[PDB]
Write a protein that binds this ligand. Structure first.
Ligand SMILES: *[B@@]1([O])O[C]([C]C([O])=O)[C]=[C][C][C]1[N]C(=O)[C]C1=[C][C]=[C]S1
Ligand SMILES: [Cl-]
Length: 359
């Protein structure tokens, strides 16, 4: 499949998508034959008439969780934490007896027993954060029910960096971003970079993400399409990652911990076995499945990375919608960054269609 044909397949999928979903701007990377290929469409900022470029910063939303998963894996590989350890090992002040039996694994993979999708808006400091988790009453025993949640993996990422003594942003930069040369990926956008920051859009209004507790760990990363392509490349082919603990952390994040229907839960990353049909992946992305509390089948010991996987993550904020998927066996992958949050099934369908052209 030539560069020219690939550019046509991308244009012919994305242009109708943007029209149908009222998306002002998109940046796309396709990973193919050892390198990224970049396609940019529309506007980063409508009022200012600024085009999307390969340097335009997008809000990743929950694709931030893949960075959380890999940083946590790296901590495991340094010997600083174990997924088998009790959450209370890293938070001794968390004295409530309901936390017994809840492992760092459970926090990382949404199986703690019903931690909710969000940290409540009244949580504004450490005292309030502690109170929230102290007062939480699990609806299910640990290791029985997956409920996708910021309050779960968010807390995992905060606790994962504690033994290192490093704050979370610092740990992420030193241990994940810098070694991979992701030098335009930000939890907090510096002043000097602000001109690259797209506006998000919802129902015609410009919007950007506001602060919340555990945001950095759950939904706070911003990045451009070059850094995201290289992030996808590193996760798709970790054999080329030099730092030993980081390479193992990447493997840990794509390891299978639980089966839930047709999908498997990694650390941030989710996986289906390849080959998989589009309707299987599309159906799973629907909110009525994706947000539901669902029974789990344990994968113990965790299964190491399966090369024949569809590996993916969707993420949104108020004004952005992003999606990434890759197939390590085929060495193909895609990044779709957009400045409006459009339906996840639509992201999956487009990503699957483009990657199908490469098979
Ligand atoms: B995150 O982006 O993940 C999505 C995944 C999906 O769409 O199935 C859903 C919920 C949690 C995450 N999103 C949010 O927390 C919403 C926002 C965060 C900041 C502003 S809105
Ligand atoms: Cl600690």
């Amino acid at each position: 499949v030539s560069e020219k044909q690939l550019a046509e397949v991308v244009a012919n999928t994305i242009t109708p998508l943007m029209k149908a979903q009222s998306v002002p701007g998109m940046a796309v990377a396709v990973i193919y034959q050892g390198k990224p290929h970049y396609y940019t469409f529309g506007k980063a900022d409508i009022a200012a008439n600024k085009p999307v470029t390969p340097q335009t910063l997008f809000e990743l939303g929950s694709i931030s969780k893949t960075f959380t998963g890999v940083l946590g894996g790296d901590a495991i590989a340094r010997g600083e934490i174990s997924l088998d350890d009790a959450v209370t090992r890293y938070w001794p002040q968390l004295t409530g007896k309901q936390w017994q039996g809840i492992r760092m694994l459970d926090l990382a993979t949404y199986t703690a027993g019903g931690l909710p999708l969000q940290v409540p808006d009244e949580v504004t400091d450490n005292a309030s954060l502690l109170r929230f988790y102290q007062n939480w009453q699990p609806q299910w025993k640990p290791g029985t029910t997956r409920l996708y949640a910021n309050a779960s993996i968010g807390l995992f990422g905060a606790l994962a960096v504690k033994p290192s003594g490093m704050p979370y942003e610092q740990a992420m930069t030193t241990r994940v971003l810098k070694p991979l040369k992701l030098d335009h990926t930000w939890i907090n956008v510096p002043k000097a970079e602000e001109a690259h920051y797209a506006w998000g859009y919802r129902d015609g209004k410009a919007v950007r993400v506001s602060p919340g507790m555990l945001d950095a760990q759950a939904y706070g990363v911003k990045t451009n399409v070059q850094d995201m392509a290289n992030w996808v490349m590193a996760n798709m082919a970790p054999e080329n990652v030099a730092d030993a603990s980081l390479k193992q952390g990447i493997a840990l994040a794509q390891s299978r911990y639980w089966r839930i229907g047709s999908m498997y839960q990694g650390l941030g990353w989710e996986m289906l076995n390849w080959p998989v049909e589009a309707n299987t992946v599309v159906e799973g992305s629907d909110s009525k499945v994706a947000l539901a509390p669902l029974p789990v089948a344990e994968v113990n010991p965790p299964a190491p990375p399966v090369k024949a996987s569809w590996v993916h993550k969707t993420g949104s904020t108020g004004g952005f919608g992003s999606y990434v998927a890759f197939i390590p066996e085929k060495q193909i992958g895609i990044v779709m960054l957009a400045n409006t949050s459009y339906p996840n099934p639509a992201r999956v369908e487009a990503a699957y269609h483009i990657l199908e052209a490469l098979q």
